[PDB]
């Protein structure tokens, strides 16, 4: 339910 919602901050860091 809240796993992704870790990854989901760093996944968008780099992606800018």
Not at 3 to 11: E, H, S, T, V, Y
Request: proline share 6%; aromatic share 18%.
């Amino acid at each position: 339910g809240a796993a992704l919602q870790i990854p989901f901050a760093m996944q968008m860091a780099y992606r800018f």
